[PDB]
């Protein structure tokens, strides 16, 4: 098995990217698990929004990390070539485990 776990910042780009992976492996023909949402991680960073003394009146900046999963069973190298062949959005990093 080749299990692809892809992470990104956009849910739209990771959904169309997962559509590219499902359309790719499904196009070459294999047994493939569809896109599974692993949930998130959020990094919340509270910033005192003042150059000088105003400890109250903050603004806090979050950080969304979207995690999608596609599990690949029964790999054939004509399918494995198209994995390293094209990645379209490139804001997505793909873990191959």
């Amino acid at each position: 098995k080749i299990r692809i776990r892809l992470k990104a910042y956009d849910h739209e780009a990771i959904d169309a990217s997962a559509r590219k992976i499902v359309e790719t492996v499904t196009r070459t023909g294999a047994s493939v698990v569809g896109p599974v949402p692993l949930p998130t991680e959020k990094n919340v960073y509270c910033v005192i929004r003042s150059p000088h003394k105003y400890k109250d009146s903050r603004e806090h900046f979050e950080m969304r990390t979207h995690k999608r999963l596609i599990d690949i069973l029964d790999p054939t190298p004509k399918t494995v070539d198209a994995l390293m062949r094209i990645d379209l959005p490139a804001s997505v990093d793909v873990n191959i485990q």
Binding site: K7, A8, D93
Partner: protein, 210 residues
């Protein structure tokens, strides 16, 4: 005073895209540092040239630096002579290799950053400031298709001692509406008496385009 949040940072989730785009775990502080030194390296000669936008896409450690400007011809002088010099210095300052894409905006008077460029560069050049504000406007409203127009100039206007803010507009510029597609640009004039910070809001349209 006016506690107005930067609207490109107020709609950066909804309408306006990020300028820099990648994914980074445990490489992020390095990508930040390279992003900063790249934008400092693209400040000077491109601010002579007419720079508006500096996007950095970043693939598997190549890099892709893309610039939206208002004159392909000052950014690209002799082919490779003006392009590949700043490109090559981006290749040496970063520990990477640079694919520099350079492209023109269809209307320079449409972008709020370039309006702030032309206004503040006129205001360093000893022209009348109310005449300058009026020049940038009116013509901008028609140019392509804008609905909003807010030009605020603070600082030593005309070389006076008091720091008088000015406020000219035309049309509709709603900031609290999030389906606004507002371009925002503040650029700061450099006179001998000081610096005249110019803010320009440009409201293109109602269109979500979701």
């Amino acid at each position: 005073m006016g506690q107005k949040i930067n609207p490109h940072g107020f709609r950066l989730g909804i309408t306006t895209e990020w300028k820099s785009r990648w994914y980074a775990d445990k490489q992020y502080k390095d990508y930040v540092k390279e992003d900063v030194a790249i934008r400092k390296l693209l400040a000077t000669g491109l601010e002579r040239a007419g720079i508006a936008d500096v996007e950095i896409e970043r693939t598997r450690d190549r890099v892709r630096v893309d610039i939206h400007t208002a004159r392909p011809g000052i950014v690209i002088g002799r082919r490779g002579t003006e392009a590949d010099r700043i490109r090559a210095d981006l290749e040496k300052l970063t520990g990477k290799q640079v694919q520099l894409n350079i492209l023109e905006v269809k209307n320079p008077e449409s972008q709020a950053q370039l309006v702030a460029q032309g206004v503040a560069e006129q205001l360093s050049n000893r022209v009348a400031f109310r005449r300058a504000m009026r020049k940038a406007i009116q013509s901008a409203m028609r140019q392509p298709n804008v609905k909003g127009i807010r030009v605020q100039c603070s600082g030593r206007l005309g070389g006076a001692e008091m720091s008088r803010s000015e406020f000219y507009r035309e049309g509709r510029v709603p900031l609290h509406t999030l389906r606004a597609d507002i371009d925002y640009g503040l650029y700061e004039a450099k006179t001998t008496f000081g610096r005249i910070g110019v803010k320009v809001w440009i409201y293109k349209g109602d269109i979500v385009g979701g």
